[PDB]
Design a protein around this ligand. Structure first.
Ligand SMILES: [K+]
Ligand SMILES: [K+]
Ligand SMILES: [K+]
Ligand SMILES: [K+]
Ligand SMILES: [K+]
Ligand SMILES: [K+]
Ligand SMILES: [K+]
Ligand SMILES: [K+]
Ligand SMILES: [K+]
Ligand SMILES: [K+]
Ligand SMILES: [K+]
Ligand SMILES: [K+]
Ligand SMILES: [K+]
Ligand SMILES: [K+]
Ligand SMILES: [K+]
Ligand SMILES: [K+]
Ligand SMILES: [K+]
Ligand SMILES: [K+]
Ligand SMILES: [K+]
Ligand SMILES: [K+]
Ligand SMILES: [K+]
Ligand SMILES: [K+]
Ligand SMILES: [K+]
Ligand SMILES: [K+]
Ligand SMILES: [K+]
Ligand SMILES: [K+]
Ligand SMILES: [K+]
Ligand SMILES: [K+]
Ligand SMILES: [K+]
Ligand SMILES: [Mg+2]
Ligand SMILES: [Mg+2]
Ligand SMILES: [Mg+2]
Ligand SMILES: [Mg+2]
Ligand SMILES: [Mg+2]
Ligand SMILES: [Mg+2]
Ligand SMILES: [Mg+2]
Ligand SMILES: [Mg+2]
Ligand SMILES: [Mg+2]
Ligand SMILES: [Mg+2]
Ligand SMILES: [Mg+2]
Ligand SMILES: [Mg+2]
Ligand SMILES: [Mg+2]
Ligand SMILES: [Mg+2]
Ligand SMILES: [Mg+2]
Ligand SMILES: [Mg+2]
Ligand SMILES: [Mg+2]
Ligand SMILES: [Mg+2]
Ligand SMILES: [Mg+2]
Ligand SMILES: [Mg+2]
Ligand SMILES: [Mg+2]
Ligand SMILES: [Mg+2]
Ligand SMILES: [Mg+2]
Ligand SMILES: [Mg+2]
Ligand SMILES: [Mg+2]
Ligand SMILES: [Mg+2]
Ligand SMILES: [Mg+2]
Ligand SMILES: [Mg+2]
Ligand SMILES: [Mg+2]
Ligand SMILES: [Mg+2]
Ligand SMILES: [Mg+2]
Ligand SMILES: [Mg+2]
Ligand SMILES: [Mg+2]
Ligand SMILES: [Mg+2]
Ligand SMILES: [Mg+2]
Ligand SMILES: [Mg+2]
Ligand SMILES: [Mg+2]
Ligand SMILES: [Mg+2]
Ligand SMILES: [Mg+2]
Ligand SMILES: [Mg+2]
Ligand SMILES: [Mg+2]
Ligand SMILES: [Zn+2]
Lengths: 206, 122, 125, 114, 53
RNA sequence: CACCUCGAUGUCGGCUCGUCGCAUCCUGGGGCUGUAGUCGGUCCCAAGGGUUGGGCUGUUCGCCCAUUAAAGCGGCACGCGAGCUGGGUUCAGAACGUCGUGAGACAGUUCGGUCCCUAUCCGUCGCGGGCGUUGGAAAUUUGAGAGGAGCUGUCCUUAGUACGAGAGGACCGGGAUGGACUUACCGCUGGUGUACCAGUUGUUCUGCCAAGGGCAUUGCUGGGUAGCUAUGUAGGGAAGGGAUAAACGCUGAAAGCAUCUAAGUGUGAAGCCCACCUCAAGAUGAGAUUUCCCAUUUCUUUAAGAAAGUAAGACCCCUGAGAGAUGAUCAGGUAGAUAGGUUGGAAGUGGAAGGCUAGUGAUAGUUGGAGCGGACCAAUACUAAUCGGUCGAGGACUUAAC
RNA sequence: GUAGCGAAAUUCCUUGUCGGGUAAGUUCCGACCCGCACGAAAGGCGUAACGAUUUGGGCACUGUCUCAACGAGAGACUCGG
RNA sequence: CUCGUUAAGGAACUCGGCAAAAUGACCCCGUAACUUCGGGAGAAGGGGUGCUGACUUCGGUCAGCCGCAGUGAAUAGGCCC
RNA sequence: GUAUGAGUAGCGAAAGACAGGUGAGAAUCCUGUCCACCGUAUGACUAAGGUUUCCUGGGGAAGGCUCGUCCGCCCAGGGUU
RNA sequence: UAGUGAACCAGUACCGUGAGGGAAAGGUGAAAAGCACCCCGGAAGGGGAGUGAAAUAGAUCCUGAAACCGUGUGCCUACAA
């Protein structure tokens, strides 16, 4: 089981017993199965799913031709789902938030918000140097290694571009499903900026 | 958030007035202690006639903090000072009377005697 | 957000006030890209105050517009001087009474010689 | 944001009285010590109101046994049976943090009788 | 830190490979036909989008 | 010992950053035991992870205090000073004890004592351009390979059972909940929030009152939106296979017995390979699937020839942010909600101005939850994304089969 | 080698021993004296006031630190000289 | 690099509280050991500070009013053993 | 003499903005308005020192850390009773 | 780059308080016949047209090497240490 949606935002919800939990609102307009991949043709089993209808002027002739089989408008996002029952799906089929039930345990995949160019202290959570006592070492990345190699070992972590990484959060709880609004309320927080792509899958660990 | 060198008032009549945190028990690298945590402390200032006296190493439980606690219902409690109660090893308070309010979290931490003795539990 | 224009907060505020008053007076001025893209919002908000026209908007604008001479004319055999605030609340407001925002336009021109700074003309429509 | 508002409109409460910081309130807060459930009244002055919609929260401060205590509640928490405005106070600001420093007479708030 | 070795001509030219200018966005002015930067007022006739300014 | 370095290889300790060995501190597995149980002792396998906060001292070391499952030992120029410090050692000053007739001297002490360098190359962390991947493009993808993670406490139950005379007190098994670490995020608690709101002092200006502007660290002070944030919140190291280490075997001869081994066959660990997460076809071994365009013109030449209009498409340029040093990425360019403005809201602040009333007055009430309102929300083509331009295929050969 | 002082700007052994201070003090203060190697004008002992002197303790205060976060400006970054 | 703010803690940093923070103006009360009797001493520790009236012996006092805060900003000792 | 570093470091405390003029050419020159800075000075006089840098009219070779139509620069005249 | 330091306005310029120290810098052409005139340009500088035996002898002027820089391309080069 899987679906693609948009990170609408965050709020909080009161559950039965009065507990208050933070939830993330993720909207998922019904996704469409655009292509079925099989061992015979592609060598592996998976279903291609498209989401977020896209304006024709924003689409291309190749994209329109590709989505023609499913007979649907151009989709902004396309992703492949594995570990699904190929029998249950076929091109043109729709997938909605109702596929999940409240209390489901899911893996949520997103693209982390970007922080641009960041130093080692923030990027890797390394320790600063003393800020007084004559120290002239405040936010620097530490020694690069021993003398003997006459080089620097790989993985000597340094400053650079931070964020924008594919990150999966495992075992999040499906707080609520609103089929009317195509909304899923997921307990906790999820990676990605608002309006970014989010992928929900049935938790592999469970 | 109580850590080493943090000073706390004493909310009981055991004799001690102000204590200084020596250790935050419950872990090798634990840094901060909150309501319901037990700390090793030293008596820095003591009431002259009290049982507990200055310079003794004692165990105490935190009963209220400036940074208080969050409840499962989403509410919060905060106090205007950081106070603790000196306890024997079995959580029985050394003193006989408690001063000021106490947090309700001590109940699930099983400081029932302190909870009962407290003039008010919140 | 808003641009810093390479100035401190107070200096940027003063520069924006100066440029906005100059644009009110002259109705067409040449500046840089960023200066134009900030002055558009500032001057349009001043125009909104003028369109409102009440004393509250008058004083709110007065807090921003410079006390400069917008124009001088010979009338009733005497000289009449109109300040930037008076022009704002007498001409620009009534002029734009029917326009729903977007009172200014920016046209991109050649870059400056001394800097290659991208220059533009900002003017009331 | 409109979607969030629509989602949380259902759980928004409707029995909240009109109170602002500076008003003394009594909070019938449900409390459970096991199987038994009970109502404990926390009465004090409102020191802070913040947030919006379902996320709105308010803080009530009272001096009990000579020790200040502040409780923060979600405005729409179902665990609070009732909020009762005992009095209205004249305050000149939304956040009354300065009261934390004051004690006794200095902390008194004049009443307005709205 | 100083150059251990002088940079050779070939290496210098390689490094300068990307040290060059570009001229982009030039197209015929609709009014007079003289070339102009797109989205800019034509410096020759002063027109833009078919209007003198 | 004196082999490199005295036309200079920076010396103790500490900080940041680690990485590696196992002669293993804990955690994991096991044999023996002077192993009743709980604790242990010793030895074998095991380096996956972790292996602390202070007082003293320049210190290493060491003692001590308090914890922890544990508080390992070592190499890497006794790692790491073009990464930091400079307390000690080791200049010039001065002093004490001592030696010396003396200048002076003392691994004898004490107070004070300049730590320079704009990264060329390799190396490391990130981001682009070109070409290749053999017609040209738009997407989705397998995974050769690589990296990340790998820790553990306590309590309840089994059970006061097994064991033990008693005291005491389990293995295995099943649950709950933490510490440290770590991946994300701003709904909550808070921080910040220099073009948000309010109070206020001095002075100065708008001719004066009123109302405001300038400067005084944002003049100061009380709050605070978005964004960025931890101490705040959520999640993770879960189960599980394959082959193994030490160890234990089963069957079994050599060697009628015995024997775990020689053949044959199995159990067996935080260990190895998977399993979990991430990058990944420049993996030149350049992979795979779906979709789109179509075989054009001229000259040369049988040329895998050349250039010149193109198609699918891409870019230039322009409006921007959820992106960003710049490139890039992504959202849009009137086939339009991309941004500004406008309208309506929201957070936020806390009751605007001008009046009215009361008061001698400061001031209070009322008009009125008012006024103002950066980044937030929804509409609105009013302003600006116009007009245009550039690049971009016609698909080689051999041999199976058809 | 007297008075006085003494593990001291002098005590190597040495973190001497004891007490105070601290949860814990090789530093510090008080005391002892086997003064390696104090000692009376290269002065001995003490001393109010004074010291940008050296040393130890305490209150207040704080990012110094647990442990880092945000914001303003200059440089760094892009462009023209 | 210069500067502002910072939850909880408040020297746990460190060779060392280095740096930073805090005190800081005037008026009133009060002020220790020791002392060379001068000092210590601005010891320490506290209280007041705005605006409007009335009254003042002109320094005050009484009453009222406002704010979180009245040397409302800037410039002004940290203290003790 | 010419390279490399490299079109890199640096361009030496701080507020300018617009309109008009001049001109081959203007962020840099003139004018105007507003804004901002010093004001026991960044104001007004003088000694030393410098020695024409003073004024007027031209110039943009070189200098001015950019530009320059401008200058304490260059060219021509004048100026100290 | 020799030869006096000085073949040239040299003990000069410059440096130093002073004693003192102390440079660089020759060559058009036979003859200036030193490019009238035209074109671009504000000028500089160029292109013509001319002088000249020669102007790639045009005043930085005889010859004009090398370092260094640039233009065009016959061949090679984007799996290589
Ligand atoms: K040497
Ligand atoms: K054993
Ligand atoms: K290990
Ligand atoms: K230490
Ligand atoms: K090591
Ligand atoms: K160094
Ligand atoms: K090299
Ligand atoms: K804040
Ligand atoms: K004022
Ligand atoms: K001013
Ligand atoms: K490929
Ligand atoms: K009003
Ligand atoms: K409001
Ligand atoms: K002694
Ligand atoms: K001695
Ligand atoms: K002791
Ligand atoms: K002294
Ligand atoms: K001194
Ligand atoms: K700070
Ligand atoms: K610390
Ligand atoms: K020390
Ligand atoms: K004193
Ligand atoms: K007051
Ligand atoms: K003072
Ligand atoms: K050079
Ligand atoms: K160079
Ligand atoms: K001139
Ligand atoms: K010649
Ligand atoms: K060549
Ligand atoms: Mg640290
Ligand atoms: Mg090597
Ligand atoms: Mg200011
Ligand atoms: Mg103006
Ligand atoms: Mg509110
Ligand atoms: Mg020999
Ligand atoms: Mg050498
Ligand atoms: Mg071993
Ligand atoms: Mg200490
Ligand atoms: Mg070393
Ligand atoms: Mg080094
Ligand atoms: Mg002698
Ligand atoms: Mg000194
Ligand atoms: Mg938040
Ligand atoms: Mg928010
Ligand atoms: Mg006034
Ligand atoms: Mg929108
Ligand atoms: Mg001693
Ligand atoms: Mg002792
Ligand atoms: Mg002597
Ligand atoms: Mg003598
Ligand atoms: Mg003496
Ligand atoms: Mg440049
Ligand atoms: Mg703080
Ligand atoms: Mg605080
Ligand atoms: Mg310490
Ligand atoms: Mg330490
Ligand atoms: Mg200091
Ligand atoms: Mg003040
Ligand atoms: Mg460089
Ligand atoms: Mg300058
Ligand atoms: Mg001033
Ligand atoms: Mg002054
Ligand atoms: Mg002059
Ligand atoms: Mg002149
Ligand atoms: Mg110049
Ligand atoms: Mg000579
Ligand atoms: Mg020749
Ligand atoms: Mg020649
Ligand atoms: Mg290869
Ligand atoms: Mg090749
Ligand atoms: Zn034109």
């Amino acid at each position: 089981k899987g679906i693609l949606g948009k990170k609408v935002g965050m709020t909080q919800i009161f559950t039965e017993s009065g507990e208050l939990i933070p939830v993330t609102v993720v909207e998922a307009t019904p996704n469409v199965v655009l292509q079925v991949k099989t061992v015979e043709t592609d060598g592996y089993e998976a279903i291609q799913v498209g989401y977020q209808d896209k304006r024709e002027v924003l689409s291309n002739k190749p994209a329109k031709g590709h989505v023609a089989k499913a007979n649907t408008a151009p989709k902004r996002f396309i992703k492949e789902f594995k570990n699904v029952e190929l029998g249950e799906y076929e091109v043109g089929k729709e997938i909605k938030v109702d596929v999940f039930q409240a209390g489901d345990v899911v893996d949520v995949t997103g693209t982390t918000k970007g922080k641009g160019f960041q130093g080692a202290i923030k990027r890797h959570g390394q320790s600063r140097g003393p800020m007084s006592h004559g120290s002239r070492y405040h936010r620097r990345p530490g020694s690069m290694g021993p003398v003997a190699p006459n080089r620097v070992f790989k993985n000597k972590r340094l400053a650079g571009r931070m964020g924008g990484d594919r990150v999966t959060i495992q075992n999040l709880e499906v707080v609520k499903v609103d089929v009317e609004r195509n909304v899923i309320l997921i307990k906790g927080n999820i990676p990605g900026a608002k309006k970014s792509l989010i992928t929900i899958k049935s938790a592999v660990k469970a | 958030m109580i850590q080493q060198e943090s000073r706390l008032r004493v909310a009981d009549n055991s004799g001690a007035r102000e204590i200084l945190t020596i250790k935050v028990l419950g872990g090798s690298g634990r840094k901060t202690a909150n309501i319901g945590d037990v700390i090793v402390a030293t008596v820095k200032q003591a009431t002259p006639g009290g049982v507990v006296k200055k310079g003794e190493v004692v165990k105490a439980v935190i009963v209220r903090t400036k940074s208080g606690a969050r409840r499962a219902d989403g509410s919060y409690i905060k106090f205007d000072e950081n106070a603790a109660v000196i306890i024997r090893d079995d959580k029985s308070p050394r003193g006989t009377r408690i001063f000021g309010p106490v947090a309700r979290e001590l109940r699930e931490n099983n400081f029932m005697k302190i909870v009962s003795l407290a003039p008010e539990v919140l | 957000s808003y641009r810093k224009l390479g100035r401190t907060s107070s200096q940027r505020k003063a520069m924006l006030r100066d440029i906005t008053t100059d644009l009110i007076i002259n109705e067409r001025i040449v500046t840089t890209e960023a200066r134009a893209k900030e002055v558009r919002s500032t001057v349009e908000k001043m125009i909104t105050l003028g369109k409102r026209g009440d004393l509250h908007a008058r004083r709110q604008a007065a807090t921003f517009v410079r006390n400069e001479v917008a124009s001088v004319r010979e009338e009733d055999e005497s000289i009449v001087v109109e300040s930037a605030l008076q022009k704002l609340f007498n001409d620009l407001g009534p002029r734009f009474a029917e326009r729903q925002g977007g009172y200014t336009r920016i046209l991109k021109t050649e870059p400056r010689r001394g800097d290659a700074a991208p220059m533009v003309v900002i003017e009331f429509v | 944001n409109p979607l969030i508002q629509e989602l949380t409109q259902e759980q928004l409460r409707t029995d909240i009285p009109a109170f602002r910081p500076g008003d003394t309130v009594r909070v019938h807060a449900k409390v459970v010590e096991g199987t038994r459930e009970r109502i404990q009244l926390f009465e004090g002055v409102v020191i802070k109101r913040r947030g919006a919609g379902i996320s709105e929260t308010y803080t009530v401060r009272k001096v009990s046994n000579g020790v200040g205590v502040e409780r923060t509640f979600p405005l729409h928490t179902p665990r609070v049976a009732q909020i009762e405005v005992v009095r209205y106070g004249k305050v000149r600001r939304a956040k009354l943090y300065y009261l934390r420093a004051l004690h006794g007479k200095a902390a008194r708030i004049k009443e307005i009788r709205r | 830190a100083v150059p251990a070795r002088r940079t050779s001509k070939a290496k210098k030219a390689k490094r300068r490979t990307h040290y060059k200018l570009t001229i982009k966005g030039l197209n015929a002015c609709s009014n007079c036909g003289e070339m102009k930067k797109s989205h800019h007022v034509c410096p020759a006739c002063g027109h833009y989008d078919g209007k003198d300014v």
